[PDB]
Amino acid sequence: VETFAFQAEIAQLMSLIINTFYSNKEIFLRELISNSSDALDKIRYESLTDPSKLDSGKELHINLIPNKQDRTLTIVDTGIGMTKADLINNLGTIAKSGTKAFMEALQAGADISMIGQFGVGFYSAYLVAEKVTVITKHNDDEQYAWESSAGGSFTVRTDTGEPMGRGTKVILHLKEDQTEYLEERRIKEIVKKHSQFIGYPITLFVE
Ligand SMILES: COc1ccc(-c2c(-c3ccc(O)cc3O)n[nH]c2C)cc1
């Protein structure tokens, strides 16, 4: 298990998301689905000139898996996934510069719902999750598990869990007062409100 410190600016971003009074938390789902859509666009584009890029799985889709017993909401995609290096380097985001631009915008009237315009929408997971686990598999690397409960550090380990072929799995260990995001009608509502034009099937699993 390797432990890393977040860059000062990323720890600042996470503290802002955790500590700012902001009721519109439901946008975390749109943000994570948007990242899933971007990763699926990436593998689809590569496959247009190289069909073997899909040897690790042809289906391009998103699964939403609530689990009331574990108090987890899992978002699975069959996108391009990430290398260990990209996972350590702020989960493939330009988080340092993105955070700076987002901070300036917040002082210029913007609100947390606009986080995605600054390329750091992944970190909106901390509006609803006390801990986030990211399992990822890229065609050019092994399967890795990234994890953080914020507090300035994250861990990276080789994943021993279920192999996923190719893509990214975001496991949201929800805060006790955020369990509405495990309810079928609530998830359906949010998907319809903010992710209705996503170009990949979104399957909402039942329990
Ligand atoms: C906007 O920046 C980014 C940065 C990285 C990605 C990304 C993800 C991913 C990352 C997070 C996630 O929730 C789901 C995913 O498939 N997987 N692979 C890539 C290249 C997507 C958007």
Q: What's domain 1-207's superfamily in CATH?
A: Histidine kinase-like ATPase, C-terminal domain (3.30.565.10)
Ligand 1 contacts (CB < 6 A) are 32, 35-36, 38-39, 42, 77, 79-82, 91-93, 119, 122, 168, 170
Convert 106-116 to b/e letters by CB count within 10 Å (16 or more is b). beeeeebbebb
Specify the 3-state DSSP secondary structure of 80.
coil
> Contact 81/139 with Cβ under 8 angstroms?
yes
Whole-Å CA distances, 86 to 37, 39, 83, 200: 17, 13, 5, 24
d(CA 104, CA 175): 28
d(CA 12, CA 20): 12
> Contact 84/77 with Cβ under 8 angstroms?
no
Pick the atom of ligand 1 nearest to 94's CA: 2
CA–centroid distance, 81 to ligand 1, in Å, is: 7
Nearest residue (by CA) to ligand 1, atom 20, is 39
Q: What residue ranges do the domains of the chain occupy?
A: 1-207
d(CA 196, CA 199): 9
d(CA 79, CA 103): 29
d(CA 115, CA 128): 15
d(CA 6, CA 148): 10
Method: X-ray
Q: Which of 205, 2, 13 is nearest to 102 (CA)?
A: 13
> Contact 18/126 with Cβ under 8 angstroms?
yes
